[PDB]
Design a protein around this ligand. Structure first.
Ligand SMILES: c1cncc(Cn2cccc2)c1
Ligand SMILES: [Zn+2]
Ligand SMILES: [Zn+2]
Length: 583
């Protein structure tokens, strides 16, 4: 308790010694409270005018227009201790899983060099603004690194002074850039060296672009077994137990020397003991602590969520298959049965899953899995929008399964080749492309963000009539040589390029498609297929509406409207690519 977190608390106390007051009307129940101090400050969602001017029919669709307008009661909940049988199942499975992930990988420290490069190419690290302005300025100043070094030698000493979270079904915990470095130096190898790639982890998808996920689900569907289960957890990050954090820390058993000590300190001092500062409107700053739940960098959060989700789903599979009888207690021969199951079929059972942090798809050996709920509920991983003990609804067709906010279509090209494409309701896609975040956007920067969305649509959603037309319109309206932009884990985004989108389509869906037999490149957009016209409406297309009718016929007008506002620039017409405009 206060021996590990006291120093951090002590230090913040003295920076606001004029204000420190143990408030009596504090709202926290499951968070330990410590004191309050005086502050006074808060980042709303702004409209992208280039995208909105070129999507006029959606100006009257509330599911689009409402997205641009406008639970911290769940972070203040408690998760009961799992039973002894459950704690033993998790320890055996975690020990086995780290071993498997480590067979072809070597834990290693990430470097100042590596960290610096990441700051200079814009990444969502979750730092704050204070002595230096941006991350860019702190990383070039030698002062920073002496603060980093002092903390670093404190961690080797088993102590912490400045690794403090700043709070803001979401909750992002910003830290200062120095604490973010020490986290990256010790644990960044999990992401930098792709420990959760599908090649390495068999269940994972790390590095897989949206164009691979449908093919991966179709491959899981080819396995013999029961329904495909895709159960969402209610507030995954809030249900991470201290038992989970101890199984995650076992990655340090694979480390040596300095690295081992630095990683042990990240887990013990900052993950298994947190200090947080929260804005209350009643405006004070509350200094609160707790031992459990997930509050780490976003990228480490993704890899450890993937790990613990892989562990939980193997255990739910063991329960369905009758490997153990009760979570109350594992007998000695049940332990050896669990171990022997892992050794004999663990890798096969990982390959029946697609896991992206808290998001999973599982094709179990049979449907006993649907009612195998005791371990899942006792680990705290309670399913969303179903009653605790109600059996899971499975999906009979891989093309209906939700994963990473998408579903996937099987689409046959006029030449017989098969595409498996990503899809979601088109209102969600259009509504998201019409939104910017942050201040000080020039017209050029707004246009280049519009162009990023357009190129994404050409590569991923070319099969949606409205998006291919709107993408061609935005690319026609933005100067041809202007570079697509975005402010700041992600798989590589191949739409982020000034390369000819048609040449990218050919390499992504044909040349470098490990699922595609024939490597013959496509020599015209008009060869590339759409979904069915009825399947497009189902997925939220405005095809058929008079609003969409004129918008299409008269798009050249909207394209030229935008061209005039950006100004005298080289513009290309990509609409003639459309069969409708193509004579
Ligand atoms: C994070 C890191 N690597 C892959 C994913 C999966 N994914 C791809 C597109 C949308 C989701 C997520
Ligand atoms: Zn620290
Ligand atoms: Zn669809």
């Amino acid at each position: 308790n206060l021996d590990i977190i006291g120093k951090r608390i002590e230090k913040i106390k003295q920076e606001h010694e004029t204000s420190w007051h143990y408030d009596q009307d504090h709202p926290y129940k499951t968070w330990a409270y410590h004191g309050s101090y005086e502050t006074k400050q808060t980042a709303s969602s702004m409209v992208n005018g280039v995208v909105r001017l070129l999507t006029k029919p959606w100006d009257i669709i509330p599911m689009v227009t409402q997205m641009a307008m406008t639970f911290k009661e769940k972070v203040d909940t408690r998760t009961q201790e799992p039973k002894e049988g459950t704690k033993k199942l998790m320890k055996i499975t975690a020990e086995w899983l780290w071993k498997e992930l480590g067979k072809k990988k070597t834990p290693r420290m990430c470097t100042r060099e590596e960290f610096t490069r990441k700051v200079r190419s814009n990444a969502a690290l979750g730092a704050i603004f204070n002595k230096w302005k941006s991350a860019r300025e702190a990383v070039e100043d030698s002062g920073f690194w002496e603060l980093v070094d002092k903390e670093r030698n404190l961690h080797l000493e088993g102590k912490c002074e400045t690794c403090v979270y700043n709070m803001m079904s979401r909750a992002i915990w910003y830290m200062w850039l120095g604490a973010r470095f020490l986290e990256f130096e010790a644990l960044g190898f999990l992401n930098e060296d792709h420990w959760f790639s599908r090649e390495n982890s068999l269940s994972g998808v790390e590095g897989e672009g949206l164009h691979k996920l449908g093919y991966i689900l179709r491959d899981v569907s080819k396995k013999e077994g029961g329904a495909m289960y895709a159960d969402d957890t209610a507030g995954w990050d809030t249900r991470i137990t201290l038992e989970d954090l101890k199984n995650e820390e076992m990655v340090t058993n694979h480390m040596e020397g300095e690295h081992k000590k630095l990683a042990e300190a990240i887990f013990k001092l900052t993950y298994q003991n947190k200090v947080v500062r929260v804005q209350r409107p009643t405006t004070v700053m509350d200094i609160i602590s707790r031992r459990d739940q997930r509050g780490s960098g976003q990228v480490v959060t993704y890899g450890l969520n993937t790990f613990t989700n892989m562990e939980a789903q193997l255990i739910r599979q063991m329960e369905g298959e009758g490997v153990f009888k009760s979570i109350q207690h594992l007998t000695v021969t049940e332990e050896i049965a669990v171990k022997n199951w892992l050794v004999r079929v663990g890798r096969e059972r990982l390959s029946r899953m697609a896991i992206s942090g808290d998001d999973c798809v599982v094709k179990p050996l049979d449907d006993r899995f649907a009612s195998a709920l005791t371990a899942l509920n006792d680990m705290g991983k309670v399913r969303k929008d179903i009653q605790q003990w109600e059996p899971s609804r499975g999906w009979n067709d891989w093309t209906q399964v939700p994963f990473c906010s998408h579903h996937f279509h099987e689409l046959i090209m006029k030449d017989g080749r098969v595409l498996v494409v990503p899809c979601r309701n088109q209102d969600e896609l259009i509504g998201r492309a019409r939104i910017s975040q942050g201040a000080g956007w020039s017209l050029r920067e707004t246009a280049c963000l519009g162009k990023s969305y357009a190129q994404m649509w050409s590569l991923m959603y070319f099969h949606r009539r409205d998006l291919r037309l709107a993408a061609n319109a935005i690319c026609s309206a933005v100067p041809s040589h202007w570079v697509p932009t975005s402010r700041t884990i992600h798989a590589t985004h191949e739409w982020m390029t000034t390369e000819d989108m048609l040449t990218v389509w050919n390499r992504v869906w044909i040349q470098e498609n490990p699922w595609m037999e024939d490597k013959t490149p496509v020599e015209s957009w008009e060869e590339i297929p759409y979904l069915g016209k009825r399947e497009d409406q189902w997925c939220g297309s405005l095809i058929g509406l008079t609003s969409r009718a004129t918008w299409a016929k008269n798009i050249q007008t909207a394209i030229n409207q935008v061209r005039s506002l950006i100004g005298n620039e080289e513009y290309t017409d990509y609409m003639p690519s459309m069969k409708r405009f193509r004579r």
